[PDB]
Subunit: 158 residues, 4 copies
């Protein structure tokens, strides 16, 4: 069996719903996939339950280091800081990362007016990802821009 | 009829899907609701189509100023800068704003350990929204934390 | 006639606090008729008894924005500061011009053809991104500059 | 024995460039045995012919991270810089300690009972937020400080 850690923000309803939607597609791909989704394991917010950052980081890292493959969602105004740190841990431990990046503002490389606009001040139409975090992914993994490509890449790594 | 402008990030698949999911619930609320969703009106990314920031801001503002009510999604690591600007325009023009904020890290006010942890350095478990943007909303509108409360608030403003 | 300037920008980290003070000093040295309001100079000292909720936070800041003749906005950061973005929207709707500063070094490279060709690859964009709705509101009645020299020069022309 | 320090932090705006240089000067003045690497001092001059994609960007920076004995990280900003967060994850997994600086003025007010009671209201949190996974990795082998004085004091103790 292949153990997958699904890295991604899990705090808003938009992200919670999208994670569950993607994960079910990944789990229906192959019965040997053992995917760990953090939102499925978080304790319901109770007034007596508490864990500090050290406990949080230690428990989260244990799930990362136990996986064979990390699936990371990079979308947002910036890459989620927790996801970025998890990618750094995975790279240093040799765990491959397949990342999904669907931002519609990444398209336009064939649009010569978008390219020319870069000569103007504050006219860039291409969304930006921190290239250090991206480079760590590509040094052992891949960044895909569609759910179709993500499922195929996970399938080819089984 | 009541015209609504749905403000929110519309670039990732997670946000695109969540916007369409929420908007259909808002439209099924009342037949007099005329909701404008920007993603339903964006041109398909074609290599010849281009508009600079001034054209983008002018067309977007025209849709904001034509609405009777603004629905704003505040979730994310930060409030979307475009949404924040749209809220500033709406407040200065007297257009009310009903905002949705579902981040699960906002809960814990009854957790005394989370409160005590604030005496430590870098142990805050409560997600942060820029309070200037939030204040503009509350000066003429409301911030709700659930889709159920959002639909009821929109219903009560018809 | 005095020119009242509102200095919009994040003011929470030491890096931003020091940079705001370093820029405001240069702006005030341009002309004696400049009456610049800097929010960090008016913030109340942190006290366990004092409290102001979001409504009176936004109202107090908006009062200073609306009383200004020109708004200087700092756009740098991983994203445009949400408060600054909202203040820009207020300024545009009220007709108050905005001169914005954007020094991010990742905005350069329009002449580099390899940077342009890299956009055909997934996740290889080297150009920092600003939300173009916020930028457009500035340019519709103002200007975005990329250096402190051009910022001071633009402020002088608007006196 | 020399102590090699990697200075992690955003280095793209003038505010961050000036603050990094202002802090690094103080750090180097602590002890002659400090060999601090500052990425902005090694960046190539912007040239339309030079290009490095994300893989060689990450590799070049990781080489400097892994060659260090201590990592100093700046966490301020609306969010922790994504590159800094990744570098912290690399440092933790390799066992390189991290001393982080976090000066955001919105972290104060734990004694204010009205700030604490305001958390029962929707969208009234006055306390700035840092991703606690990134913070936890630091404290598991290092420390987070809230002032430049405590940063220099902590660096001296680790020499």
């Amino acid at each position: 069996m292949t153990k997958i850690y699904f890295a991604g923000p899990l705090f808003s309803q938009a992200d919670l719903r999208y994670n569950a939607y993607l994960v079910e597609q990944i789990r229906q791909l192959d019965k040997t996939i053992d995917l760990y989704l953090p939102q499925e394991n978080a304790a319901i917010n109770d007034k007596s339950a508490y864990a500090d950052s050290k406990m949080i980081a230690l428990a989260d890292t244990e799930n990362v280091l136990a996986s064979d493959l990390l699936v990371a969602l990079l979308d947002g105004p910036t890459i989620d800081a927790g996801v970025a740190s998890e990618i750094g841990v995975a790279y240093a431990k040799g765990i491959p990362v397949v990342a999904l990046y669907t931002d519609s503002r990444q398209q336009g490389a064939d649009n010569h007016q978008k390219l020319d606009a870069l000569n103007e001040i504050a006219e860039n139409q291409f969304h930006y990802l921190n290239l250090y975090t991206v480079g760590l992914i590509k040094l052992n993994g891949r960044v895909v821009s569609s759910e179709e490509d993500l499922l195929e890449e996970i399938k080819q790594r089984l």
